[PDB]
Design a protein around this ligand. Structure first.
Ligand SMILES: Nc1nc2c(ncn2[C@@H]2O[C@H](COP(=O)(O)OP(=O)(O)O)[C@@H](O)[C@H]2O)c(=O)[nH]1
Ligand SMILES: *C/C=C(C)/C=C/C=C(C)/C=C/C1=C(C)CCCC1(C)C
Length: 389
């Protein structure tokens, strides 16, 4: 009896420790994948509040915790492998299945052990349990690389760790084991809830990493609407390197006239057009054929090139004078931050005179095109300005 109360005290402290850790590390994940770890911290917080409360024992106290957390634990798993309509369909179906599973378990546990109502709730709960575990096994078939390995660990934890619950359910009918049921339930809750949140965190950590061999890092940013983006800058600013790093498609290089090189990348309804500004004066008039309906203007500048930083400003200001780009949102990539002589973002802002720009929605991001750092942050801002406005 005293061991059952000691585990309730350990569970309360354990759930709270996993709550703050899951919250403290949530800032490292990109905002696209932070929803999973937020739910993960919410599961431990709900378990902490209910284990603080834990005639006789209160079965309803634990089943109230299960009926809320189990669907949420499926939400943070489905938020990893699905998105959009497929995510909402699975959350509804799995949440309903978990609700019937937990509800049937409460119907049977609140009856006489070994009675027909006890086994009926066991039969219904096991059927939905097998259904949930079969759908979980079939999840993540499209994942590859580190995400597939990370999701395999999430699957294995639930597929193995949740077996303790039906075993603990049948303990009262295989022996004088009323106390070991709460022991099995409590230890399983600590292992599964704290464990899944850690595994959900490591998953979202992978989805936010710089490795992009499978080309998934920058696709969940721009959405489905039309978005014409012009990315210009001086030669050797890093524009082609950024195009490759986006992993949004093969670069299409054209030469419409001798001395004018154009690079395009198309994905969904999103397009990047790239050329070098400056150069010969006879080339500048040809840029006007590409300005119409441009929604985003990305200006790349070599932060390590201090001799040409003043010409970079002159080209940007000439571009911002074009009437066809009066509504274009400006995003400035302070590229090559990894180089030792690289000017910081505030210095590039001062050298380019961005604070003098009126009626212009702009933003500057320090970036390293070789490693990709900063590219997601700048594009997430640009995508947010163009989608929400
Ligand atoms: N160290 C460093 N080098 C970069 C970075 N971005 C581009 N480069 C280098 O700059 C050189 C030319 O860049 P490029 O993409 O061709 O610039 P573009 O002419 O505007 O397309 C390449 O050799 C890149 O390796 C960066 O962020 N850091
Ligand atoms: C955070 C709490 C967790 C993950 C609880 C999970 C509960 C289940 C997997 C247990 C379901 C049951 C059966 C499969 C059979 C007997 C009745 C239940 C409810 C114990």
């Amino acid at each position: 009896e005293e061991l059952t109360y000691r585990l309730f005290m350990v569970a309360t402290v354990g759930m709270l420790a996993g709550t703050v850790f899951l919250l403290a590390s949530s800032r490292e994940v990109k905002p696209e994948h932070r929803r999973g770890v937020y739910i993960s911290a919410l599961v431990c917080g709900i378990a902490w509040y209910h284990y603080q409360k834990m005639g006789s024992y209160d079965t309803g106290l634990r089943y109230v915790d299960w009926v809320l957390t189990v669907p949420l634990m499926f939400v943070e798993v489905l938020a990893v492998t699905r998105k959009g309509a497929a995510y909402n369909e699975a959350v509804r179906n799995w949440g309903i299945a978990a609700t019937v599973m937990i509800g049937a378990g409460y119907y049977g546990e609140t009856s006489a052990a070994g009675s027909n109502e006890y086994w009926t709730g066991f039969v219904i709960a096991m059927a939905t349990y097998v259904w949930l575990m079969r759908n979980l096994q079939a999840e993540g078939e499209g994942l590859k690389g580190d995400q597939a390995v990370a999701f395999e660990n999430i699957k294995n934890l639930i597929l193995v760790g949740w077996i303790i619950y039906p075993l603990g359910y049948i303990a009262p009918v295989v022996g004088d084991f009323d106390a070991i049921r709460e022991v099995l339930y409590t230890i399983a809750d600590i292992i599964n809830k704290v464990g899944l949140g850690v595994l959900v965190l490591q998953m979202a950590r992978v989805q936010s990493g710089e490795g992009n061999i499978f080309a998934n890092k920058f696709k969940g940013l721009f959405g489905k609407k039309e978005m014409r983006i012009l990315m210009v800058g001086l030669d050797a600013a890093g524009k082609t390197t950024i195009l490759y790093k986006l992993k949004l498609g093969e670069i299409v290089t054209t030469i419409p006239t001798i001395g004018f090189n154009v690079e395009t990348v198309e994905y969904k309804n999103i397009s990047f057009t790239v050329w070098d500004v400056g150069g010969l004066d006879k080339i500048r008039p040809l840029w006007r054929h590409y300005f119409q309906n441009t929604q985003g203007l990305i200006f790349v500048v070599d932060s390590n090139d201090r001799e040409r930083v003043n010409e970079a400003r002159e080209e940007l200001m000439r571009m911002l004078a074009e009437d066809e780009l009066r509504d274009a949102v400006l995003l400035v990539f302070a590229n090559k931050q990894d180089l030792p002589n690289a000017m910081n973002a505030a210095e590039i802002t001062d050298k380019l005179g961005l604070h003098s720009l009126r009626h212009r929605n702009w933003y500057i991001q320090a970036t390293c095109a070789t490693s990709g750092d900063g590219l997601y942050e700048g594009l997430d801002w640009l995508s947010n300005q163009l989608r929400n406005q």
